[PDB]
Every structure is written in structure tokens, then in C-alpha cells.
Amino acid sequence: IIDGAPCARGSHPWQVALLSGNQLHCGGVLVNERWVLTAAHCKMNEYTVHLGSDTLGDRRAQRIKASKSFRHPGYSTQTHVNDLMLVKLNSQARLSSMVKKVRLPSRCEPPGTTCTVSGWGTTTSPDVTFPSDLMCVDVKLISPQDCTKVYKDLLENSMLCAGIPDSKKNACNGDSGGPLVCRGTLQGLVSWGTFPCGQPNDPGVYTQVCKFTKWINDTMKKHR
């Protein structure tokens, strides 16, 4: 997260991290006891899911293996369209005040809406600074018309853009697949942006969760 601050303790219980060799790989969101939602770009054959702590490396946290995952079949490595995947936890997440399911959206929140993106991704770019504590930054949803000025025809209708004018405030590598929450609901998954991160007037690009509700519920149902 570039130009953010530590999240208030206990306010991101639906936030998870995907680890590989005890190192941060991606962010993600807890959907229910058996499922984590993340970016298709985070695909691995095995995952270690960290749940229940704002601090990576906490002994208090749950560490659950995940040996199955399903990317949206329309996902493209070339364009990053349909960038989403469901990760199936080997055992159920043990829910508490620190482990909760995210509120999935019913509607798509409009341009100009204030949101919070969170994660343990680097806080600097190009040079890497990986924090221990979960970082937060507020961004505003950007219209597809305004976002097209920057990314042209790479942008699709199921992609959502967010950021702050003349600001470095954004998501970076390690935040990928993590949550963008607007008015109590999950509106996006960190998908991509420019590199180096935190480039002013270059929005962060997110997978628009409100357009994938059916595939999300249908995939959990079929692979239950």
C-alpha cells in the first residue's frame, strides 16, 4: 500500500494473506469458512492462508493450507480480464471477532465513492519495504471514461478503477487479490496498475466484484 497508514486493529477480519515459503504472495478475502476470494494472477498449486491477525508473523493467527483453487475461465494473463479465483481451504476457518466473512455486494457502488484498500504489500516503489502490520489507504472510485484516458482499450467493463487526484495513494505488489471496500461491501480485488507503484494520476485497477456474484456463488456450490 503506497502513502497509507496502519489499519485500525480488528477492523479487517475478512482480510487474508496468501503465503508461499513463509513469504507474502498475495492478499485475499474470506468469503465463508471454506473459501477465500483473490486474483487469478495469484494462482499456485498450494497456498498457506494467514487469517485473524493484522500482523503477518503473528502466532495468534490461523495458518490454513489450501490445495485447490479455481480461476474464472475467462481469465487472461495477457489483458488481466476476469482476474479472480476462489481458493478452497483444506479445513474450515475458525470464525471469531478477528475472523469474519466479507459482505459481498448486491449493487455496484458509482464513480466518486470513497473506498479503502488494504494489504501487506510494499509501501515504497521501486525499492521494496514489506510491512508487518496491515496498511490502509482511502481512494475514490474513478469513472471508466476517466480511467480510459490512462489505460485505453486495456480496460474492460468488469474492471474497476480507484485513486486520488495528484496522489501516490494506491495498492502495490503483494496487495494483489486484496480487498477494496466501499460503503460496507467488497467492490473490488486488487488486480493491476502501473510500475513503479504510486504514480500520481495513474489509477489502481480492480476486478469489479459486483459483476461476478453468480460465478462466485456457483463455483462455491459446485466445488463444496
UniProtKB/Swiss-Prot annotation:
PANTHER family: KALLIKREIN-7, KALLIKREIN-RELATED. CDD domains: Tryp_SPc. Glycans are attached at residue 217. Coiled coil: none annotated. This is Kallikrein-7. One of its GO terms (cellular component) is cornified envelope. May catalyze the degradation of intercellular cohesive structures in the cornified layer of the skin in the continuous shedding of cells from the skin surface. Specific for amino acid residues with aromatic side chains in the P1 position. Cleaves insulin A chain at '14-Tyr-|-Gln-15' and insulin B chain at '6-Leu-|-Cys-7', '16-Tyr-|-Leu-17', '25-Phe-|-Tyr-26' and '26-Tyr-|-Thr-27'. Could play a role in the activation of precursors to inflammatory cytokines. It is an enzyme of class 3 (hydrolase). It comes from Homo sapiens. It is found in: Secreted. GO terms for molecular function: metalloendopeptidase activity; peptidase activity; serine-type endopeptidase activity; serine-type peptidase activity. The active site is at residues 41, 83, 176. Belongs to the peptidase S1 family. Kallikrein subfamily. It comes from the Eukaryota. The record marks 80 as: Major binding site for inhibitory zinc or copper. Its main location: secreted. GO terms for biological process: epidermis development; extracellular matrix disassembly; positive regulation of antibacterial peptide production; protein maturation; proteolysis. Inhibited by Zn2+ and Cu2+ at low micromolar concentrations. Inhibited by SERPINA12.
